[PDB]
């Protein structure tokens, strides 16, 4: 209203429209809280690469749309998913985000190895962890917390110029608590860098064994069964291991519901031995530094990257598939 006509029609004439440039009808590969994700081909075929198109849930510039666009417009790192283009569709007020398509992800990769029971190759496990840490270190250095790290959010590029490169993404969701740090489960009010590190520790365990380390049945921040699973694996923390546990809002609920003597024979050492990871391995000693119960005693992403595990034979590779043939099936349509 009251908008100059020449200005308006010029912009309309020049404005690239998502439906003109890309073929995506019937190609939905993702449905979630944040939007719909399509595997797309360019119509003007100067290109045979696959593209991902995300139609953001809702219309207009929601807090969600604004956050994703503002952050992704600035972030540039090889291990963080890269926004290529934003399309603003005036007819319906819909927002579309364009990305280079990442064929694979750790949810599907882990499921493949869990079903074939072939464990994940140890070179691949290390290369995946190194690139996850590299991407999160970059995010953390820029005070961007992920807040929902899990295998489904660790993308891996398929055949093409970025073959085997990890891309950290945020796909959204109803919910599991298997990657949630114990302080969140005890009512911690704020997301932190340490919370991301715990989740990475969980992913690392799962890469080593093919099983989610803190797998739990379906159930306020307090989640009894998830905590019970953590204690069954890790043992119940001693006062000296986590001195500020008493300051957690649900600490008295924890004391009411749990008794340390229930978990006397429980330790990460014992759990990982059952899955044939040796407790004297550099792998195990790194894992244990990530899966530390007290968040102030977890190592940082940078420190993790400097771990002697990454200097031990075999070295991490840029292509996590190590140039070898990719057995994992392409992502299926929903």
């Amino acid at each position: 209203d009251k908008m100059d006509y020449d200005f308006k029609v010029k912009l309309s004439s020049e404005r690239e429209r998502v439906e003109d440039l890309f073929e995506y009808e019937g190609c939905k590969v993702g449905r979630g809280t944040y939007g719909h994700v399509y595997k797309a081909k360019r119509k003007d075929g100067k290109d045979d690469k696959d593209y991902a198109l995300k139609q953001i849930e809702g219309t207009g510039i929601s807090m969600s749309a604004c956050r994703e666009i503002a952050l992704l417009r600035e972030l540039k790192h090889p291990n963080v998913i890269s926004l290529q283009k934003v399309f603003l569709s005036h007819a319906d007020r819909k927002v579309w985000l364009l990305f280079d398509y990442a064929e694979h992800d750790l949810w599907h990769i882990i499921k493949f190895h869990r079903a074939s029971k072939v464990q994940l190759p140890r070179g691949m496990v290390k290369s995946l962890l190194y690139q996850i840490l590299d991407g999160i270190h970059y995010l953390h250095a820029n005070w961007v917390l992920h807040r929902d790290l899990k295998p489904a959010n660790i993308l891996v590029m398929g055949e093409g110029p970025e073959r085997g490169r990890v891309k950290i993404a945020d796909m959204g969701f109803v919910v599991t608590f298997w990657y949630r740090a114990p302080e969140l489960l005890l009512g911690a009010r704020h997301y932190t860098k340490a919370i991301d590190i715990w989740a990475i520790g969980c992913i690392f365990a799962e890469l080593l064994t093919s099983e989610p380390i803190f797998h739990c049945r379906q159930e306020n921040p307090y989640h009894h069964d998830q905590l019970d699973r953590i204690f069954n694996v890790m043992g119940f923390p001693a006062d000296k291991d986590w001195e500020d546990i008493k300051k957690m809002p649900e600490h008295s609920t924890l004391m009411k519901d749990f008794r340390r003597n229930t978990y006397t024979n429980c330790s990460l050492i014992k759990y990982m031995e059952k899955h044939k990871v040796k407790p004297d391995s550099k792998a195990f000693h790194l894992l244990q530094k990530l899966l530390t119960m007290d968040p102030i005693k977890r190592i940082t992403s940078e420190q993790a990257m400097q771990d002697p595990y990454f200097l031990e034979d075999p070295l991490p590779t840029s292509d996590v598939f190590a140039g070898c043939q990719i057995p994992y099936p392409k992502r299926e349509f929903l």
Binding site: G60, I61, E74, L88
Partner: protein, 267 residues
Amino acid sequence: DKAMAGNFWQSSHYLQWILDKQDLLKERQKDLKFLSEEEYWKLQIFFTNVIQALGEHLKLRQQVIATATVYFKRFYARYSLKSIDPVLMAPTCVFLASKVEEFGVVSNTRLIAAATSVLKTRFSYAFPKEFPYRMNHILECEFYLLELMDCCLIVYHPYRPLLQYVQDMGQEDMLLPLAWRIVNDTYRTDLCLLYPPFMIALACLHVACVVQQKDARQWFAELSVDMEKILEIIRVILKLYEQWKNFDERKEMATILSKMPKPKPPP
């Protein structure tokens, strides 16, 4: 700490939205057929004040107001004043800035009531008619704004580096209130489009030191920065206060606003 805080040198702000002065003035010639150079810088002061007033009414922090102001400036750096009514653009920029800076979505009723109240109570000298726009206009304008900015939303301001400089000086109590106020005043000019925020912070701090007769020469000399650029900025700041003195906004703005180029209506 805030997202992307140490990333200015790889930021969209730095790489796309530090403009060349000659490019800015070339694009401005469109509007200088209708307005003098003087009248154009008076309009910029005026709309800076409108955005500030809108932000104050909505209880937004200065950094949100600053971001909204930068969005406004970026738009009209590229486009004519006739393209979208700046009366519509100003509250749209505040609305988008509030979302980006993570304070939230100002409600339909509140945004429009703030626009209406502010123009009525603080700018009746310029606007005899009520704020004529509704939320559907704001939402449409927001789409055009985001497109013109090429989705560059995160903006860096001089307040943070200023605070770091005065802390380093050990003179936060003495110098920060004045230097901060001078940073606010720089948004009356084109400075934020032309120089990195830290240079603007240094220039404002220098002017505060001169005003309060504080010798900071040794501290300034010890910095590794192009002082020729800092002096360019200081000159614009000193001129903005002489312009302020000579400008009677309340007496002049109604006539200046009537000289703004008007949009073409549809055929």
